[PDB]
């Protein structure tokens, strides 16, 4: 039920939509191709059967920002017009299933539970972005990075000996995209955390040596 | 079906839920009372039958921010736990209707259209906050105040003579709450826009003398 998200990646997946894909339209996308073209008006939920999509917002002046990443069993909830210009691209070969409003009616008539999984998915997203705005108005850049690593360890940290391991690739670029923080500050904070023997943000893994001090510093 | 919003106030109203409130639980709140108490686990959608609610988030250090205002026909979508601490107060006497998951099944088994109205309401909320995150990572505080005014004018501004008039109560305080800007910046921007002959943020109205400039 739990509709929390720490990072804007794989928001509340709904594997069970796989059972309904013959009610929608299968559309495939080569690596680097546009799932949602800039300016295109989308009026379908887009279910990600397999692959990976990066979904950005583009402003009036052409400026572009990450909204989220999506992988297998993710849902793009763009059933109605929103006034935002979205650009979504396939990061690898990607199979999607596009569900119109009418096709969704057929889904819910078959399985009423699908309704509530989609509410979960929407709610996850609201809670994540609403919190993020508030947090950006409350904590400074270094604090946001520390709060991110703390929350991530608290959530996903697996006790390996005297440490917690977070088994994920989280690049410096992505931490910047997520936190809004510029690259030099991201570099500097990561480097201190490692020099202070607190955490070591590696390529394929984050090792937290001293979670109590990360928590303390995040405050 | 338009799911845009400029102001985090009265997100996508669903007046038709008025038809189904006998399927939920009616709860009234006096002015100043908590609809959602800080630290309360909410597992209900809450429909606002009449009145007005200010809905905030609270962080672990007790610091607090506005998420949104809500009036008649508004929906609070907190059906499941989110991990956020939410405090929602009645700004005037307010009648609410709480829908559990169970009761929402009853509603949807009666009228399938209500599922899509709820999707519209959620979508409007995701589109609002997601844009705002990105906006905050792209544009400095002053530019976000100027974007607020321009967007407001070209959606709601009625072309009256030489100027542009937007009929709404938008206080300096709430301009800050929305844009994330400190009160002193908001004053020093607004008193500029009047002095330059571009905008006047009077109490009840907003008069844009030059939209091209804005
Ligand atoms: O990934 C698949 O399920 C099939 C698929 C989809 C999209 C593509 O561009 C390719 Cl090469 C294959
Ligand atoms: O399309 C929008 O404006 C925002 C958005 C983007 C992607 C999604 O999955 C959702 Cl629910 C909304
Ligand atoms: O509960 C949250 O975490 C955020 C939130 C608040 C109010 C709402 O109406 C929704 Cl859909 C989400």
Residue numbers in the entry:
A (entry chain B): 9 to 227
B (entry chain A): 9 to 222
What does the paper behind this entry write?
The transcriptional regulator CprK from Desulfitobacterium spp. induces expression of halorespiratory genes upon binding of o-chlorophenol ligands and is reversibly inactivated by oxygen through disulphide bond formation. The CprK associated with the o-chlorophenolacetic acid (OCPA) reductive dehalogenase (CprAB) from D. dehalogenans and the closely related D. hafniense has been shown to bind OCPA with μM affinity leading to sequence-specific DNA-binding, and ultimately transcriptional activation of the associated cpr gene cluster. Members of this family are homodimeric and contain an N-terminal sensor domain linked via a long α-helix (involved in formation of the dimer interface) to the C-terminal helix–turn–helix (HTH) DNA-binding domain. We here present crystal structures of the oxidized ligand-free (3.2 Å) and reduced ligand-free (2.0 Å), OCPA-bound (1.8 Å) and DNA-bound (1.8 Å) D. hafniense CprK in addition to an intermediate OCPA-bound structure obtained by soaking ligand-free crystals (2.0 Å).
In order to avoid formation of the inactive, oxidized CprK under aerobic conditions, the CprKC200S mutant was used to obtain structural insights into the reduced CprK structure. CprKC200S:OCPA crystals were analysed both in the presence and in the absence of glycerol cryoprotectant. This resulted in minor differences in crystal packing. Comparison of the individual monomers within the asymmetric unit of both crystal forms does not reveal significant structural differences for the entire β-barrel and associated α-helices of the N-terminal sensor domain (residues Asp-17 to Val-141). Moreover, a comparison of the available individual CprKC200S:OCPA monomers reveals an identical conformation for the N-terminus, with the exact position of the different DNA-binding C-terminal domains only influenced to a minor degree by crystal packing. In contrast to the marked asymmetry of the oxidized CprK:OCPA structure, near-perfect twofold symmetry relates the monomer structures within a single CprKC200S:OCPA dimer. This arrangement places both HTH domains in a position compatible with binding to the palindromic (de)halobox DNA.
